[PDB]
Amino acid sequence: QFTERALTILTLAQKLASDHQHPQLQPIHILAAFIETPEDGSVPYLQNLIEKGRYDYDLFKKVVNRNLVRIPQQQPAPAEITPSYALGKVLQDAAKIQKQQKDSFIAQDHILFALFNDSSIQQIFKEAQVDIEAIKQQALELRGNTRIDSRGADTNTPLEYLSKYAIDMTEQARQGKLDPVIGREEEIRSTIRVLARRIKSNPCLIGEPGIGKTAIIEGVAQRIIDDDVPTILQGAKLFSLDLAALTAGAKYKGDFEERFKGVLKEIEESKTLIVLFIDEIHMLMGNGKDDAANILKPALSRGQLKVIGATTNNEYRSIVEKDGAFERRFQKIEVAEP
């Protein structure tokens, strides 16, 4: 059985073949599936690998597409897509590779490596001036010692869940999408000092929801980019948790928790510091909601999760009363009306 992501690649591969007028599914359709631009703004598994190796990805897409239109299109298109000879070899090759790595499932990793054995794929790569061997090293670099023992272990990038369910504010500040903050110099400076602490290094902005707490977070993100922060915060990423994105699409039981776990995992296992801002932390922390709290609280206790919280005075006092460990983990910062 394939992974969730690998199955998606295969499904999209034949979907592309169906979009075109090709009767047979070929290896190039899988390659085209890998470079397919997702609508969720995620970074495709193969895109990351190619542009991580300092290769030209735009050129690569052009070659693949010009090779996908090069093959004849059947005007009397039949309602049946049978796998070609080359494809069958690839799929079988992917099963061999996953068994050699003692993986539990056939991931997009194995499929990619199987494509590298195909003649047409190799010719495409050589035509796109992209060295397959260098790409192989990237994939090995990405996965590392991580075994595919689950149907969702073959994540595309180390920031897949963060890119889907959170907003990179540091990137937004760098891209010039954030308006400059005015009159919050003290709150901004206080939030930064706390983040740079050793003990109780998690800021929690306290105030009425009718105030601009997110402005402070934007200010902090801008300071980080300009290196106007202590050395420990330099080069850090500041993400804002998007609760709306988390629940959107989550139609099954346990779907929310899986997405939340995926986000926290990418943060805790990140080589570079990542700060997570949670606008309504009491909706995920307070005694009223212990479902998502059983995910966030253990993560915070492991000490590899730096979080900027935001809540009201009444709600803050509520979480404190229910759990006295919150006071030792979070440093309250009052935000008043300017």
Numbering used by the authors: 6 to 343
Copy out sentences from the published article reporting this entry, exactly as the authors wrote them:
Members of the ring-forming Hsp104/ClpB family of ATP-driven molecular chaperones are the principle protein disaggregases in fungi (Hsp104), plants (Hsp101), and eubacteria (ClpB). At the molecular level, Saccharomyces cerevisiae Hsp104 forms a homo-hexamer that is stabilized by adenine nucleotides. Each Hsp104 monomer features two ATP-binding domains, termed AAA-1 and AAA-2, in addition to an N-terminal (N) domain and a coiled-coil motif that mediates the physical interaction with Hsp70. It is now widely accepted that Hsp104 facilitates the unfolding of aggregated proteins and the threading of substrate through the protein translocation channel analogous to ATP-dependent Clp proteases.
Here we present the orthorhombic crystal structure of an N-terminal fragment of S. cerevisiae Hsp104 (Hsp1041-360) comprising the N domain (residues 4–164), the AAA-1large domain (residues 165–341), and the first α-helix of the AAA-1small domain (residues 345–356). The structure of Hsp1041-360 was determined by molecular replacement and was refined to a resolution of 2.6 Å. We did not observe any unaccounted electron density that could be attributed to a bound nucleotide, even when 5 mM nucleotide (ADPNP or ADP) was added for crystallization, indicating that Hsp1041-360 was crystallized in the nucleotide-free state. The crystal structure consists of three Hsp1041-360 monomers (mol 1, mol 2, and mol 3) that are structurally independent and in different physicochemical environments, which allows the identification of common structural features that may be of functional importance. Superimposing the crystal structures of the complete Hsp1041-360 fragment through their AAA-1large domain shows that the orientation of the N domain seen in mol 1 and mol 2 is rotated by 172–174° relative to that in mol 3 with residues 161–165 making up the hinge region. The first AAA-1 pore loop (loop-1), comprising residues 253–259, is seen in all three monomers, and loop-2, comprising residues 291–294, is ordered in two molecules. In our structure, Tyr257 makes contact with the N domain of a neighboring, non-crystallographic symmetry (NCS) related molecule. In addition, the aliphatic side chain of Lys256 forms a stacking interaction with the Tyr257 side chain, which may orient Tyr257, while the ε-amino group of Lys256 makes an ionic interaction with the Glu146 side chain of a neighboring molecule. In our structure, loop-2 adopts two distinct conformations in an ‘up’ and ‘down’ configuration when viewed along the six-fold axis of the Hsp104 hexamer. Residue 292 (asparagine) that is non-conserved in ClpA/B proteins, is in van der Waals contact with the N domain of an NCS-related, neighboring molecule (Lys131), resembling an interaction with substrate.
